[PDB]
Amino acid sequence: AMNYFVGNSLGVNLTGIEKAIINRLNLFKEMGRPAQCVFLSWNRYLYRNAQNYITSSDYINMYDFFQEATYLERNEPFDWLSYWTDECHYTLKHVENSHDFRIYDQERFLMYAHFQDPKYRILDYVNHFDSQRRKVKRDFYDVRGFLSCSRILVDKQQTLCEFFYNPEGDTKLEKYFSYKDGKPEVQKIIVYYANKQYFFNNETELGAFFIKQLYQHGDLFFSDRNVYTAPIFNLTPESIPVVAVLHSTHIKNIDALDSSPFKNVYKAMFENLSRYRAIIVSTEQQKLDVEKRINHTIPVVNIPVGYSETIDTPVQTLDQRSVKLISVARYSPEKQLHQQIELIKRLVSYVPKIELHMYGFGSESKKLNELIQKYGLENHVYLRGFLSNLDQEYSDAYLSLITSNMEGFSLALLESLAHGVPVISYDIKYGPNELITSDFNGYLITKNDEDALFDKVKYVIDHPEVQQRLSKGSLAKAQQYSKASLIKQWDQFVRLILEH
Amino acid sequence: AMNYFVGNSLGVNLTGIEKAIINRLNLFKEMGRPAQCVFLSWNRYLYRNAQNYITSSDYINMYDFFQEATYLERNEPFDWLSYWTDECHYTLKHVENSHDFRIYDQERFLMYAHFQDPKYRILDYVNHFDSQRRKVKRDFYDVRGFLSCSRILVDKQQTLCEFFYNPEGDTKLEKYFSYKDGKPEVQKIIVYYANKQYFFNNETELGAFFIKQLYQHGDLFFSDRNVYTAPIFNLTPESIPVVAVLHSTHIKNIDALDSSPFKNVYKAMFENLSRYRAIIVSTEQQKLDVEKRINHTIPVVNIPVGYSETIDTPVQTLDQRSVKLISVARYSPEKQLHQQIELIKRLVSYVPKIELHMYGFGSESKKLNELIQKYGLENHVYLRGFLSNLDQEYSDAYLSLITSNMEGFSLALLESLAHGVPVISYDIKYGPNELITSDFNGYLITKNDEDALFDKVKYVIDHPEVQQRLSKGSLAKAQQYSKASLIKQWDQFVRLILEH
Amino acid sequence: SDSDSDSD
Amino acid sequence: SDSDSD
Ligand SMILES: O=c1ccn([C@@H]2O[C@H](COP(=O)(O)OP(=O)(O)O)[C@@H](O)[C@H]2O)c(=O)[nH]1
Ligand SMILES: O=c1ccn([C@@H]2O[C@H](COP(=O)(O)OP(=O)(O)O)[C@@H](O)[C@H]2O)c(=O)[nH]1
Ligand SMILES: CC(=O)N[C@@H]1[C@@H](O)[C@H](O)[C@@H](CO)O[C@H]1O
Ligand SMILES: CC(=O)N[C@@H]1[C@@H](O)[C@H](O)[C@@H](CO)O[C@H]1O
Ligand SMILES: *[C@H]1O[C@H](CO)[C@@H](O)[C@H](O)[C@H]1NC(C)=O
Ligand SMILES: *[C@H]1O[C@H](CO)[C@@H](O)[C@H](O)[C@H]1NC(C)=O
Ligand SMILES: *[C@H]1O[C@H](CO)[C@@H](O)[C@H](O)[C@H]1NC(C)=O
């Protein structure tokens, strides 16, 4: 009996929800229960993106499954440059400041090739052109080596249709697209499977078909990216058990618990609640709010998405002459990282040695860099990018900041406490209120009170005896979220969630 | 060493040029020299059309070649209807007055299937539709069973690209199209062959690649459909020998030998004369006209495209009650068949038991029918359509008429003589005056002199003893075009044409 | 009718 | 052309 956790994909940089799924696989692994991640969307880099966190046996990707590459490993690395010049007798012009080549034969421009790496061992894509230099086709290579998809283009490099191969070059899926409000949308899918040909109108229906091939009597599904996974489970028979896992606040205006509409990402889930065995949310308070709001139609339970282990890296080895503040947060607007650059702008007047290190990725990267540059803070505020392992960055961190206006839990908050780093955070739903006890492991601050935020941060900098105190309190709070107590809650859940 | 007679395709009704090619294939067979016809254009009904005249080993088609379908025969028919209902659990809804079904999956519309026969043995095409009832793909089946080509459609059923399969379903060629003056034209072709990937800009370059793969040292090519084959041979190396064969007058206005431009269908050939080992025409006079015009740049030789056997079917079993005149010619303007209908109008008042039977097909058939009604000649002039065997129709024919203004030889003229049917023909370039000796086996008449036409045809009607004499002269002249006579010329030509 | 666009 | 890459 297999436990399947169903999300969308794993990016090159892990999101919160993807980390929660990996956390859960590791907890099931340690208690001995079978679990696999299930990934729905086409991602020819998945095998690479998974490598730091899980093994090729711990996940099934739906396109891998129909493409006959599920559990397939990296290939013998193949030298495309040499094949094209030595075997094909093409001529290559390298493009400046890239891993790209233009490809000519017979005084014609044939192809544009883009590699992932500088040793040109990972071919990424190849564009093909006709006699007039229209880009008629794009070939997309899986990082394991095989050609994964060919996209046919119409008019202004618009996506008309895509073909998906097994590693031998047999076609296994076809997708046909139409543009609606400037974006391409699937209108038809053809899948060649089990010696038959199957027809679908969209990726939800293909999803549902995939789930039904995976399922054996006794398996259990967790629906973790609900804007895609719930529409899929809504098309599968009720005899397949599934649990809905919320990862964020559930309503649009969190201040109208009773009347605010459900977020768009959770609507299909809430509009078909009786399909689901239960809802799992991270925090106590969200349990109480969701159960009242759905009038107890199905069970609601709280299991934190994050846990603490004991740390085998240094903890609180501080540089005494400089203060290091940290933010572990996406470069995205609801994190409101601009407020922390403003906080630093004020603080440098009193702490000449202060630094703020912002670990993340996202869209606000440019605006935030331009804000730091407009204030001359380039020597005090660093956008460090995404690090896959933050362990050494916590070692000398004095404080963590959270200026977000909505959270489901905040894994970063629990990671900070587990590494001894007190946290100062706006008192927002959900997470901070349960993880921070003011004056014990940090401080809770009224949402968007930049004035109070400065005062409490400065007080802790002014008083390193406090910061030590809250650091011991931090390791204490984190111990309540131990690997062991989460296993207990998970094991009890899986033992009771099926009917008997 | 193999001899290759390169045309373009084979239709339902055998044309002149196609019969010239098949005649030549039969002559090389009779003398023991290997010979095959080469067809260029994509035609998934070609194995049907050819079955009546040659065998499957007597020809190579280019698309069959790269689709690995050369020398493949029919499969035993697949019961698609039964596979769709019993194995796929689709629902079929017959389209009334058609061999067509609409195909549904549980009330969802997927496919429109058109069979060729009313027995549903020969699937012709299948259209695929998306969730909005767009026609995104058309599957075209070869009459032999397999799926030959899929066409991807965009906007208003415009062709965007085509994929061509071997009989196993592997893709072997890809064509990409752009629209120019409202018609699709090839802008790129990708061929998968000999484990490599080849790129072309148009069908002519693909043709030239095909000629190169066919060639083995000592082979000889004959270019018979020069509007397509000359451009192809212009892109092949001079080391591949090719003879150009003209089948019509060579210039747009035959009365201006020195000055008229070459017909469009020969331009590309005459502009690259030094590519060709020789030019072959059918008649003496055209040899001398052409060798002058090209200033003797390459050899010009005459070998008639037609030959006679002796006939085992009956000859000159005439009805003593009526006069049967015949015309054996396309219903096409240069044959000027309206003039023979005028002739009958004038003769019917003098010899009322007359009949004119016109065998052929073409665009003029409506004007010719309207002309017959205008004159009230429905009882006397019979548009008989195209008959694939004429032997019985010549048995009771008194006289054959030719009113054409332009011929290369006229296979129908020699065929008439060989059945002992004397001929009255305008004296035009090229053929009639080499095939008819006035007062021996017919009469020649100044071009478009319709009075002289009436006079001489009346003369032969008045003198059945003359018609008997001209009949026997016809069997005699036909002997000068015997199979043995033609073999003797082809053998000498093939022995001398290659370099040494 | 619109259903005639399904053929050819 | 810059439309060559993506
Ligand atoms: O440089 C970084 C920045 C962030 N993270 C991780 O990204 C996740 C984000 O967690 P959170 O619950 O805060 O997710 P979010 O609220 O951003 O969706 C955390 O596990 C971080 O450890 C990381 O590994 N490296
Ligand atoms: O009902 C018909 C009419 C014509 N033909 C054939 O079509 C050919 C016409 O060739 P020809 O050179 O006479 O004229 P072209 O069409 O080449 O100008 C001849 O061989 C005829 O035997 C035929 O088989 N059946
Ligand atoms: C913006 C937001 O709410 N972030 C939540 C985060 O708090 C939570 O820890 C993570 C894993 O459950 O999922 C994210 O969606
Ligand atoms: C209209 C015309 O020119 N007809 C010729 C015909 O005389 C000749 O017998 C045949 C085969 O050579 O080719 C045709 O094109
Ligand atoms: C024909 O197709 C049209 C849509 O184009 C649809 O409305 C109609 O129901 C169809 N009729 C039949 C006979 O299938
Ligand atoms: C297509 O074919 C079907 C069946 O013969 C017919 O109903 C329909 O009108 C045709 N439409 C055309 C002319 O394309
Ligand atoms: C594609 O890449 C090249 C650099 O390798 C760049 O010049 C061009 O602008 C890029 N086009 C895009 C981003 O579409």
UniProtKB/TrEMBL annotation, chains A, B:
The UniProt record lists the keyword Ubl conjugation: no
Lineage top rank: taxon: Bacteria
Domain Glycosyl transferase family: 317-472
InterPro entries assigned: Glyco_trans_1
Residues reported in the UniProt entry to bind N-acetyl-D-glucosamine: 247-248, 407-410
Coiled coil location: none
Positions annotated to bind UDP 1: 330, 335, 386-387, 411-412, 415
Protein residues bound to UDP 2: 386-387
GO molecular function: glycosyltransferase activity; nucleotide binding
Keywords: Glycosyltransferase, Nucleotide-binding, Transferase
PANTHER family the record matches: GLYCOSYLTRANSFERASE (PTHR12526), TEICHURONIC ACID BIOSYNTHESIS GLYCOSYLTRANSFERASE TUAH-RELATED (PTHR12526:SF629)
Entry protein name: Glycosyl transferase, group 1 family protein
UniProt source species: Staphylococcus aureus (strain USA300)
